[PDB]
Amino acid sequence: FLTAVSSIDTFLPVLNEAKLQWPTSALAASSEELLGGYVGSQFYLQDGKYMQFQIAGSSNRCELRQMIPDGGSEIGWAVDDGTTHTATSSIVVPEQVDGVEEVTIMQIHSGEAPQLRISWIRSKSLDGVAYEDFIMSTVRIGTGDSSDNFVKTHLADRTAGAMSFQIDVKDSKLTITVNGNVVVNGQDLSFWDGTDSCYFKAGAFNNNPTSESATARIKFAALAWVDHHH
Ligand SMILES: O=C(O)[C@H]1O[C@@H](O[C@H]2[C@H](O)[C@H](O)[C@H](O[C@H]3[C@H](O)[C@H](O)[C@H](O[C@H]4[C@H](O)[C@H](O)[C@H](O[C@H]5[C@H](O)[C@H](O)[C@H](O)O[C@@H]5C(=O)O)O[C@@H]4C(=O)O)O[C@@H]3C(=O)O)O[C@@H]2C(=O)O)[C@@H](O)[C@@H](O)[C@@H]1O
């Protein structure tokens, strides 16, 4: 068998507060199964150090979903509880194979919709400007499908090396920090006030591929989910 992610220390904290959804939103592995060596080509320890996710198919996923720690059930939190909800990661996004067009690698999601997706995308025009092979944030400020429901931002061009992300939610404001630099500062999340079902996700969620067989692949050198009280 392939080497399991839980065979080293690095990812135990997040695995203790996650379930794995694969190849759909249906459960693939509970937190205890993840901590206890769940492994396959979709989810294995790569190069002795990376938690690697792989998935093919439109809207299929191999994704961690935030859980209450220590064997608990699904978590839900609010964007304005006065704490800071923080997701940190260090991600190697390799060159994606032909047919893969957008891969969501971190999210904030609720009972109804994704508040935030951080995704790699092959090609995209944003605000009249073309970008290629880059990392994007998509924030929902509404529940509809037209442009004004979203704020989409170029976060960084994709790099060969690891790229760090920090997602902070505090007092209905979102901050995104890439390689130590604040890119998105205080994006408003007030539309979501009253929602108590938000949670973090991370991994690989395959969006709008041109081929159903093309396999997205994303490597995490680090991932953590932490609520900071103030
Ligand atoms: O490309 C465009 O045309 C526009 O796309 C806009 O972004 C899109 C994305 O491309 C994706 O389509 C994205 O997909 C969302 C999807 O709409 C749902 O919200 C889905 O929800 C699932 C949850 O992630 C979660 O896995 C949930 O799990 C439940 C479930 O009951 C399950 O059975 C289990 O037992 O318990 C779990 C639980 O843990 O809570 O299931 C949900 C499900 O219905 O399957 O999540 C995906 C997602 O992961 O984000 O939607 C966005 C969008 O914003 O609508 C945007 O880029 C726009 O600019 C483009 O024009």
Side-chain angles (χ1 to χ4, degrees):
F1 302 87
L2 294 161
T3 306
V5 173
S6 60
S7 68
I8 62 171
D9 66 338
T10 299
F11 305 98
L12 303 186
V14 72
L15 297 180
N16 182 54
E17 54 173 343
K19 64 176 174 176
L20 188 74
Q21 300 174 306
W22 169 80
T24 67
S25 290
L27 174 66
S30 68
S31 177
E32 291 215 0
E33 289 176 286
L34 291 169
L35 290 167
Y38 179 89
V39 62
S41 59
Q42 70 279 15
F43 182 77
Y44 71 93
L45 190 73
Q46 201 274 350
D47 295 353
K49 66 176 142 293
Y50 302 102
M51 173 172 63
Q52 183 180 265
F53 303 84
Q54 286 193 107
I55 187 67
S58 291
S59 300
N60 282 341
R61 70 192 74 233
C62 190
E63 261 192 313
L64 297 172
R65 191 286 202 212
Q66 189 187 2
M67 304 291 279
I68 293 169
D70 313 313
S73 51
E74 283 77 10
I75 203 168
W77 44 262
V79 301
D80 57 4
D81 63 19
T83 74
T84 302
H85 293 269
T86 300
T88 49
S89 66
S90 181
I91 308 180
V92 174
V93 182
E95 177 159 0
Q96 298 298 304
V97 305
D98 296 342
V100 179
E101 306 312 327
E102 175 176 16
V103 185
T104 297
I105 65 187
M106 300 177 80
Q107 309 194 62
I108 302 164
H109 203 290
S110 68
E112 291 181 35
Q115 287 68 46
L116 169 66
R117 300 186 304 100
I118 296 188
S119 63
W120 168 84
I121 187 160
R122 188 174 295 278
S123 312
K124 180 82 182 74
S125 181
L126 297 177
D127 198 24
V129 180
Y131 296 95
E132 301 280 356
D133 191 25
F134 74 102
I135 313 302
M136 181 168 64
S137 59
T138 299
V139 173
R140 273 187 170 278
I141 61 174
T143 53
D145 304 316
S146 62
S147 299
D148 71 354
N149 291 280
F150 307 97
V151 181
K152 295 168 85 77
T153 307
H154 172 270
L155 295 177
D157 288 349
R158 187 187 60 78
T159 57
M163 179 170 282
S164 70
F165 299 88
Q166 185 171 323
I167 298 169
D168 294 311
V169 177
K170 181 188 179 58
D171 291 351
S172 309
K173 306 296 172 273
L174 169 67
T175 300
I176 304 175
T177 305
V178 179
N179 290 332
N181 307 138
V182 175
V183 181
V184 171
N185 193 26
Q187 162 70 54
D188 196 4
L189 294 177
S190 290
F191 177 81
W192 300 105
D193 286 2
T195 294
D196 195 40
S197 62
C198 293
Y199 54 93
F200 287 125
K201 312 190 87 193
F205 164 48
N206 192 29
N207 315 121
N208 307 316
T210 67
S211 155
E212 291 305 296
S213 59
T215 302
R217 185 171 65 83
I218 304 293
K219 306 204 302 190
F220 284 71
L223 179 64
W225 291 331
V226 177
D227 190 42
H228 297 278
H229 289 62
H230 302 274

mmCIF file of all heavy atoms in Angstrom, residues 19 21 25-27 59 61 63 65 74 102 107 109 112-114 117 136 138 140 145 150 152 199 201 205 207-208, ligand 1:
data_model
loop_
_atom_site.group_PDB
_atom_site.id
_atom_site.type_symbol
_atom_site.label_atom_id
_atom_site.label_comp_id
_atom_site.label_asym_id
_atom_site.label_seq_id
_atom_site.Cartn_x
_atom_site.Cartn_y
_atom_site.Cartn_z
ATOM 1 N N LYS A 19 -13.051 15.146 8.475
ATOM 2 C CA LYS A 19 -13.416 13.940 7.754
ATOM 3 C C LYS A 19 -12.975 14.132 6.315
ATOM 4 O O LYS A 19 -12.804 15.261 5.844
ATOM 5 C CB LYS A 19 -14.924 13.659 7.823
ATOM 6 C CG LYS A 19 -15.776 14.720 7.142
ATOM 7 C CD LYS A 19 -17.256 14.380 7.134
ATOM 8 C CE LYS A 19 -18.054 15.539 6.577
ATOM 9 N NZ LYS A 19 -19.509 15.238 6.461
ATOM 10 N N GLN A 21 -14.055 13.606 2.408
ATOM 11 C CA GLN A 21 -15.099 13.385 1.417
ATOM 12 C C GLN A 21 -14.426 13.020 0.101
ATOM 13 O O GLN A 21 -13.600 13.777 -0.399
ATOM 14 C CB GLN A 21 -15.915 14.663 1.253
ATOM 15 C CG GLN A 21 -16.586 15.130 2.534
ATOM 16 C CD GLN A 21 -17.260 16.462 2.355
ATOM 17 O OE1 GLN A 21 -16.632 17.422 1.920
ATOM 18 N NE2 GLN A 21 -18.543 16.532 2.650
ATOM 19 N N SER A 25 -19.350 14.402 -2.058
ATOM 20 C CA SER A 25 -19.537 14.885 -0.696
ATOM 21 C C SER A 25 -19.812 13.765 0.294
ATOM 22 O O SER A 25 -19.733 13.999 1.503
ATOM 23 C CB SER A 25 -20.667 15.902 -0.655
ATOM 24 O OG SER A 25 -20.267 17.086 -1.309
ATOM 25 N N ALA A 26 -20.116 12.560 -0.175
ATOM 26 C CA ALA A 26 -20.311 11.456 0.751
ATOM 27 C C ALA A 26 -19.014 11.146 1.501
ATOM 28 O O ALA A 26 -17.905 11.338 0.996
ATOM 29 C CB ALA A 26 -20.824 10.221 0.019
ATOM 30 N N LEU A 27 -19.175 10.647 2.719
ATOM 31 C CA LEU A 27 -18.043 10.372 3.588
ATOM 32 C C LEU A 27 -17.179 9.260 3.012
ATOM 33 O O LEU A 27 -17.691 8.206 2.622
ATOM 34 C CB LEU A 27 -18.589 9.935 4.945
ATOM 35 C CG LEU A 27 -17.592 9.455 5.996
ATOM 36 C CD1 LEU A 27 -16.704 10.594 6.430
ATOM 37 C CD2 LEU A 27 -18.315 8.875 7.198
ATOM 38 N N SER A 59 -16.910 18.292 -10.674
ATOM 39 C CA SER A 59 -17.455 18.528 -9.348
ATOM 40 C C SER A 59 -17.191 17.391 -8.376
ATOM 41 O O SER A 59 -17.749 17.386 -7.281
ATOM 42 C CB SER A 59 -18.938 18.896 -9.392
ATOM 43 O OG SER A 59 -19.117 20.076 -10.156
ATOM 44 N N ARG A 61 -14.581 15.456 -5.747
ATOM 45 C CA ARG A 61 -13.677 16.033 -4.771
ATOM 46 C C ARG A 61 -12.922 14.938 -4.039
ATOM 47 O O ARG A 61 -13.373 13.796 -3.932
ATOM 48 C CB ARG A 61 -14.442 16.887 -3.758
ATOM 49 C CG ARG A 61 -15.306 16.095 -2.833
ATOM 50 C CD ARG A 61 -16.234 17.003 -2.067
ATOM 51 N NE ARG A 61 -17.308 17.500 -2.924
ATOM 52 C CZ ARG A 61 -17.644 18.770 -3.100
ATOM 53 N NH1 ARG A 61 -16.911 19.757 -2.618
ATOM 54 N NH2 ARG A 61 -18.751 19.057 -3.779
ATOM 55 N N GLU A 63 -11.543 15.882 -0.407
ATOM 56 C CA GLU A 63 -11.482 17.083 0.411
ATOM 57 C C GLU A 63 -11.673 16.751 1.870
ATOM 58 O O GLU A 63 -12.546 15.961 2.231
ATOM 59 C CB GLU A 63 -12.615 18.057 0.057
ATOM 60 C CG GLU A 63 -12.293 19.199 -0.845
ATOM 61 C CD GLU A 63 -13.404 20.230 -0.869
ATOM 62 O OE1 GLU A 63 -14.588 19.853 -1.000
ATOM 63 O OE2 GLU A 63 -13.080 21.434 -0.790
ATOM 64 N N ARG A 65 -13.059 18.092 5.403
ATOM 65 C CA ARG A 65 -14.173 18.905 5.863
ATOM 66 C C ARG A 65 -14.061 19.025 7.380
ATOM 67 O O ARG A 65 -13.990 18.008 8.080
ATOM 68 C CB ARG A 65 -15.480 18.214 5.461
ATOM 69 C CG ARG A 65 -16.736 19.029 5.621
ATOM 70 C CD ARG A 65 -17.192 19.205 7.070
ATOM 71 N NE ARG A 65 -18.617 19.526 7.098
ATOM 72 C CZ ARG A 65 -19.223 20.292 7.992
ATOM 73 N NH1 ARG A 65 -18.572 20.826 9.011
ATOM 74 N NH2 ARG A 65 -20.514 20.543 7.847
ATOM 75 N N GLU A 74 -19.986 17.098 12.652
ATOM 76 C CA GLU A 74 -19.714 18.250 11.806
ATOM 77 C C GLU A 74 -19.799 19.549 12.603
ATOM 78 O O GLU A 74 -20.726 19.758 13.380
ATOM 79 C CB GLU A 74 -20.740 18.288 10.671
ATOM 80 C CG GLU A 74 -20.504 17.284 9.534
ATOM 81 C CD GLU A 74 -20.905 15.839 9.840
ATOM 82 O OE1 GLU A 74 -21.559 15.583 10.874
ATOM 83 O OE2 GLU A 74 -20.558 14.957 9.016
ATOM 84 N N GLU A 102 -9.754 24.135 -13.297
ATOM 85 C CA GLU A 102 -9.847 24.888 -12.056
ATOM 86 C C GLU A 102 -9.930 23.872 -10.939
ATOM 87 O O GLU A 102 -10.670 22.894 -11.058
ATOM 88 C CB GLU A 102 -11.074 25.822 -12.020
ATOM 89 C CG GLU A 102 -11.221 26.524 -10.654
ATOM 90 C CD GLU A 102 -12.350 27.546 -10.549
ATOM 91 O OE1 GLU A 102 -13.260 27.560 -11.400
ATOM 92 O OE2 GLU A 102 -12.329 28.336 -9.573
ATOM 93 N N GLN A 107 -11.567 26.153 1.181
ATOM 94 C CA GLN A 107 -12.862 26.809 1.193
ATOM 95 C C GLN A 107 -13.274 27.206 2.603
ATOM 96 O O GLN A 107 -12.826 26.632 3.597
ATOM 97 C CB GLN A 107 -13.984 25.902 0.670
ATOM 98 C CG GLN A 107 -13.704 25.250 -0.650
ATOM 99 C CD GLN A 107 -14.931 24.643 -1.291
ATOM 100 O OE1 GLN A 107 -15.884 25.357 -1.616
ATOM 101 N NE2 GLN A 107 -14.923 23.324 -1.492
ATOM 102 N N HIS A 109 -17.253 27.197 3.750
ATOM 103 C CA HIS A 109 -18.539 26.769 3.216
ATOM 104 C C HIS A 109 -19.530 26.719 4.363
ATOM 105 O O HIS A 109 -19.147 26.596 5.523
ATOM 106 C CB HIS A 109 -18.384 25.386 2.564
ATOM 107 C CG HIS A 109 -19.428 25.056 1.541
ATOM 108 N ND1 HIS A 109 -20.748 24.810 1.856
ATOM 109 C CD2 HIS A 109 -19.331 24.904 0.200
ATOM 110 C CE1 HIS A 109 -21.422 24.539 0.752
ATOM 111 N NE2 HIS A 109 -20.586 24.593 -0.266
ATOM 112 N N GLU A 112 -25.443 26.355 3.013
ATOM 113 C CA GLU A 112 -26.057 26.758 1.755
ATOM 114 C C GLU A 112 -25.089 26.993 0.601
ATOM 115 O O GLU A 112 -25.465 26.749 -0.547
ATOM 116 C CB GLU A 112 -26.928 28.006 1.966
ATOM 117 C CG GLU A 112 -28.177 27.696 2.798
ATOM 118 C CD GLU A 112 -29.085 28.892 3.018
ATOM 119 O OE1 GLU A 112 -29.204 29.741 2.108
ATOM 120 O OE2 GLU A 112 -29.683 28.985 4.113
ATOM 121 N N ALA A 113 -23.866 27.462 0.852
ATOM 122 C CA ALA A 113 -23.012 27.891 -0.251
ATOM 123 C C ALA A 113 -21.580 28.089 0.220
ATOM 124 O O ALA A 113 -21.326 28.179 1.431
ATOM 125 C CB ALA A 113 -23.516 29.203 -0.858
ATOM 126 N N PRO A 114 -20.628 28.203 -0.708
ATOM 127 C CA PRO A 114 -19.252 28.559 -0.339
ATOM 128 C C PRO A 114 -19.094 30.065 -0.166
ATOM 129 O O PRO A 114 -19.251 30.847 -1.109
ATOM 130 C CB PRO A 114 -18.426 28.039 -1.520
ATOM 131 C CG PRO A 114 -19.338 28.099 -2.659
ATOM 132 C CD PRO A 114 -20.724 27.833 -2.130
ATOM 133 N N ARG A 117 -13.849 30.342 -1.950
ATOM 134 C CA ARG A 117 -13.007 29.314 -2.548
ATOM 135 C C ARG A 117 -11.676 29.936 -2.928
ATOM 136 O O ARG A 117 -11.638 30.979 -3.597
ATOM 137 C CB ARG A 117 -13.639 28.716 -3.809
ATOM 138 C CG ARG A 117 -14.974 28.046 -3.599
ATOM 139 C CD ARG A 117 -15.481 27.347 -4.859
ATOM 140 N NE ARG A 117 -15.577 28.254 -5.999
ATOM 141 C CZ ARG A 117 -14.684 28.349 -6.975
ATOM 142 N NH1 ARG A 117 -13.640 27.541 -7.047
ATOM 143 N NH2 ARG A 117 -14.817 29.310 -7.878
ATOM 144 N N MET A 136 -6.615 32.041 -7.303
ATOM 145 C CA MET A 136 -7.703 32.998 -7.277
ATOM 146 C C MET A 136 -8.499 32.812 -5.998
ATOM 147 O O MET A 136 -8.638 31.692 -5.499
ATOM 148 C CB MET A 136 -8.651 32.669 -8.455
ATOM 149 C CG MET A 136 -9.843 33.603 -8.604
ATOM 150 S SD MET A 136 -10.693 33.370 -10.187
ATOM 151 C CE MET A 136 -11.286 31.689 -10.019
ATOM 152 N N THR A 138 -12.464 33.470 -4.688
ATOM 153 C CA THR A 138 -13.836 33.776 -5.069
ATOM 154 C C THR A 138 -14.633 33.859 -3.781
ATOM 155 O O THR A 138 -14.796 32.848 -3.082
ATOM 156 C CB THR A 138 -14.424 32.712 -5.993
ATOM 157 O OG1 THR A 138 -13.671 32.631 -7.206
ATOM 158 C CG2 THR A 138 -15.873 33.048 -6.346
ATOM 159 N N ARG A 140 -18.302 34.834 -2.070
ATOM 160 C CA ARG A 140 -19.712 35.116 -2.300
ATOM 161 C C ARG A 140 -20.189 36.215 -1.367
ATOM 162 O O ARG A 140 -20.048 36.117 -0.142
ATOM 163 C CB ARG A 140 -20.591 33.881 -2.117
ATOM 164 C CG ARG A 140 -20.718 33.039 -3.359
ATOM 165 C CD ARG A 140 -21.745 31.940 -3.154
ATOM 166 N NE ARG A 140 -22.058 31.248 -4.396
ATOM 167 C CZ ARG A 140 -22.916 31.689 -5.303
ATOM 168 N NH1 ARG A 140 -23.579 32.821 -5.140
ATOM 169 N NH2 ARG A 140 -23.117 30.974 -6.402
ATOM 170 N N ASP A 145 -26.186 33.889 -9.238
ATOM 171 C CA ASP A 145 -25.152 33.446 -10.167
ATOM 172 C C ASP A 145 -24.514 34.563 -10.985
ATOM 173 O O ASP A 145 -23.458 34.333 -11.590
ATOM 174 C CB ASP A 145 -25.718 32.366 -11.095
ATOM 175 C CG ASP A 145 -26.286 31.200 -10.320
ATOM 176 O OD1 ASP A 145 -25.622 30.770 -9.349
ATOM 177 O OD2 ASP A 145 -27.398 30.737 -10.655
ATOM 178 N N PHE A 150 -20.276 37.914 -6.510
ATOM 179 C CA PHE A 150 -18.932 37.433 -6.250
ATOM 180 C C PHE A 150 -17.943 38.585 -6.206
ATOM 181 O O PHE A 150 -18.101 39.593 -6.892
ATOM 182 C CB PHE A 150 -18.474 36.475 -7.352
ATOM 183 C CG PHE A 150 -19.420 35.355 -7.606
ATOM 184 C CD1 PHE A 150 -20.335 35.445 -8.633
ATOM 185 C CD2 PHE A 150 -19.414 34.222 -6.814
ATOM 186 C CE1 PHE A 150 -21.221 34.431 -8.884
ATOM 187 C CE2 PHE A 150 -20.305 33.177 -7.065
ATOM 188 C CZ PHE A 150 -21.213 33.293 -8.113
ATOM 189 N N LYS A 152 -13.958 38.343 -6.998
ATOM 190 C CA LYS A 152 -12.924 37.426 -7.455
ATOM 191 C C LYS A 152 -11.608 38.182 -7.577
ATOM 192 O O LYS A 152 -11.576 39.305 -8.083
ATOM 193 C CB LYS A 152 -13.345 36.760 -8.778
ATOM 194 C CG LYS A 152 -14.588 35.850 -8.624
ATOM 195 C CD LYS A 152 -15.194 35.404 -9.953
ATOM 196 C CE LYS A 152 -14.513 34.182 -10.510
ATOM 197 N NZ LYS A 152 -14.910 32.915 -9.838
ATOM 198 N N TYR A 199 -17.805 26.353 7.933
ATOM 199 C CA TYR A 199 -16.734 25.427 8.251
ATOM 200 C C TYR A 199 -15.665 25.549 7.173
ATOM 201 O O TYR A 199 -15.933 25.986 6.056
ATOM 202 C CB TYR A 199 -17.248 23.981 8.319
ATOM 203 C CG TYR A 199 -17.990 23.511 7.080
ATOM 204 C CD1 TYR A 199 -17.339 22.853 6.040
ATOM 205 C CD2 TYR A 199 -19.355 23.694 6.966
ATOM 206 C CE1 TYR A 199 -18.035 22.415 4.923
ATOM 207 C CE2 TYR A 199 -20.051 23.256 5.852
ATOM 208 C CZ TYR A 199 -19.383 22.615 4.834
ATOM 209 O OH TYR A 199 -20.039 22.157 3.701
ATOM 210 N N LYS A 201 -12.840 23.816 4.525
ATOM 211 C CA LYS A 201 -12.528 22.640 3.725
ATOM 212 C C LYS A 201 -11.169 22.854 3.077
ATOM 213 O O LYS A 201 -10.736 23.990 2.880
ATOM 214 C CB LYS A 201 -13.543 22.407 2.604
ATOM 215 C CG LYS A 201 -14.994 22.485 3.028
ATOM 216 C CD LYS A 201 -15.918 21.998 1.929
ATOM 217 C CE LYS A 201 -16.100 20.494 2.004
ATOM 218 N NZ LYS A 201 -16.739 19.895 0.791
ATOM 219 N N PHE A 205 -10.999 19.967 -5.202
ATOM 220 C CA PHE A 205 -12.371 19.901 -5.673
ATOM 221 C C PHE A 205 -12.321 20.402 -7.114
ATOM 222 O O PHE A 205 -11.904 21.537 -7.369
ATOM 223 C CB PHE A 205 -13.254 20.705 -4.709
ATOM 224 C CG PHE A 205 -14.610 21.069 -5.223
ATOM 225 C CD1 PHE A 205 -15.437 20.153 -5.834
ATOM 226 C CD2 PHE A 205 -15.096 22.341 -4.988
ATOM 227 C CE1 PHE A 205 -16.691 20.513 -6.273
ATOM 228 C CE2 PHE A 205 -16.345 22.704 -5.418
ATOM 229 C CZ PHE A 205 -17.142 21.777 -6.062
ATOM 230 N N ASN A 207 -13.271 21.656 -10.697
ATOM 231 C CA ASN A 207 -14.303 22.536 -11.238
ATOM 232 C C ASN A 207 -14.182 22.678 -12.750
ATOM 233 O O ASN A 207 -13.131 23.067 -13.262
ATOM 234 C CB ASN A 207 -14.198 23.922 -10.608
ATOM 235 C CG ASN A 207 -14.014 23.858 -9.099
ATOM 236 O OD1 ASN A 207 -13.023 24.352 -8.564
ATOM 237 N ND2 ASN A 207 -14.954 23.217 -8.415
ATOM 238 N N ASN A 208 -15.271 22.393 -13.454
ATOM 239 C CA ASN A 208 -15.380 22.631 -14.887
ATOM 240 C C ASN A 208 -14.240 22.033 -15.718
ATOM 241 O O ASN A 208 -13.725 22.686 -16.627
ATOM 242 C CB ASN A 208 -15.514 24.119 -15.178
ATOM 243 C CG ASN A 208 -16.632 24.768 -14.396
ATOM 244 O OD1 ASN A 208 -17.728 24.229 -14.283
ATOM 245 N ND2 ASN A 208 -16.358 25.938 -13.851
HETATM 246 O O1 LIG B 1 -17.883 28.296 -12.796
HETATM 247 C C1 LIG B 1 -18.978 28.924 -12.688
HETATM 248 O O2 LIG B 1 -19.833 28.854 -13.606
HETATM 249 C C2 LIG B 1 -19.282 29.740 -11.464
HETATM 250 O O3 LIG B 1 -18.823 28.914 -10.361
HETATM 251 C C3 LIG B 1 -18.875 29.605 -9.067
HETATM 252 O O4 LIG B 1 -18.273 28.731 -8.148
HETATM 253 C C4 LIG B 1 -18.979 27.510 -7.940
HETATM 254 C C5 LIG B 1 -18.014 26.357 -8.055
HETATM 255 O O5 LIG B 1 -17.552 26.196 -9.428
HETATM 256 C C6 LIG B 1 -18.581 25.063 -7.583
HETATM 257 O O6 LIG B 1 -19.625 24.681 -8.491
HETATM 258 C C7 LIG B 1 -19.132 25.191 -6.181
HETATM 259 O O7 LIG B 1 -19.749 23.985 -5.763
HETATM 260 C C8 LIG B 1 -20.267 23.978 -4.427
HETATM 261 C C9 LIG B 1 -21.677 23.461 -4.554
HETATM 262 O O8 LIG B 1 -22.509 24.457 -5.194
HETATM 263 C C10 LIG B 1 -22.288 23.061 -3.256
HETATM 264 O O9 LIG B 1 -22.416 24.228 -2.418
HETATM 265 C C11 LIG B 1 -21.421 22.040 -2.548
HETATM 266 O O10 LIG B 1 -21.930 21.691 -1.290
HETATM 267 C C12 LIG B 1 -21.414 20.492 -0.741
HETATM 268 C C13 LIG B 1 -20.542 20.857 0.430
HETATM 269 O O11 LIG B 1 -19.231 21.292 -0.007
HETATM 270 C C14 LIG B 1 -20.341 19.736 1.383
HETATM 271 O O12 LIG B 1 -19.477 18.707 0.848
HETATM 272 C C15 LIG B 1 -21.684 19.151 1.718
HETATM 273 O O13 LIG B 1 -21.536 18.031 2.538
HETATM 274 C C16 LIG B 1 -22.709 17.710 3.266
HETATM 275 C C17 LIG B 1 -23.581 16.685 2.597
HETATM 276 O O14 LIG B 1 -24.878 16.649 3.272
HETATM 277 C C18 LIG B 1 -22.965 15.324 2.629
HETATM 278 O O15 LIG B 1 -23.941 14.371 2.171
HETATM 279 C C19 LIG B 1 -22.404 14.883 3.994
HETATM 280 O O16 LIG B 1 -23.010 13.807 4.534
HETATM 281 O O17 LIG B 1 -22.458 15.964 5.034
HETATM 282 C C20 LIG B 1 -21.888 17.123 4.381
HETATM 283 C C21 LIG B 1 -21.348 18.137 5.324
HETATM 284 O O18 LIG B 1 -20.224 17.800 5.746
HETATM 285 O O19 LIG B 1 -21.894 19.242 5.621
HETATM 286 O O20 LIG B 1 -22.359 18.643 0.527
HETATM 287 C C22 LIG B 1 -22.678 19.738 -0.351
HETATM 288 C C23 LIG B 1 -23.337 19.155 -1.553
HETATM 289 O O21 LIG B 1 -24.448 19.616 -1.922
HETATM 290 O O22 LIG B 1 -22.776 18.203 -2.161
HETATM 291 O O23 LIG B 1 -20.093 22.613 -2.311
HETATM 292 C C24 LIG B 1 -19.457 22.990 -3.573
HETATM 293 C C25 LIG B 1 -18.176 23.482 -3.014
HETATM 294 O O24 LIG B 1 -17.455 22.603 -2.469
HETATM 295 O O25 LIG B 1 -17.862 24.702 -3.048
HETATM 296 O O26 LIG B 1 -20.122 26.282 -6.158
HETATM 297 C C26 LIG B 1 -19.494 27.541 -6.513
HETATM 298 C C27 LIG B 1 -20.516 28.599 -6.288
HETATM 299 O O27 LIG B 1 -20.134 29.703 -5.838
HETATM 300 O O28 LIG B 1 -21.728 28.362 -6.511
HETATM 301 C C28 LIG B 1 -18.135 30.922 -9.093
HETATM 302 O O29 LIG B 1 -16.736 30.662 -9.341
HETATM 303 C C29 LIG B 1 -18.656 31.800 -10.174
HETATM 304 O O30 LIG B 1 -17.845 33.000 -10.225
HETATM 305 C C30 LIG B 1 -18.596 31.108 -11.509
HETATM 306 O O31 LIG B 1 -19.224 31.909 -12.514
#
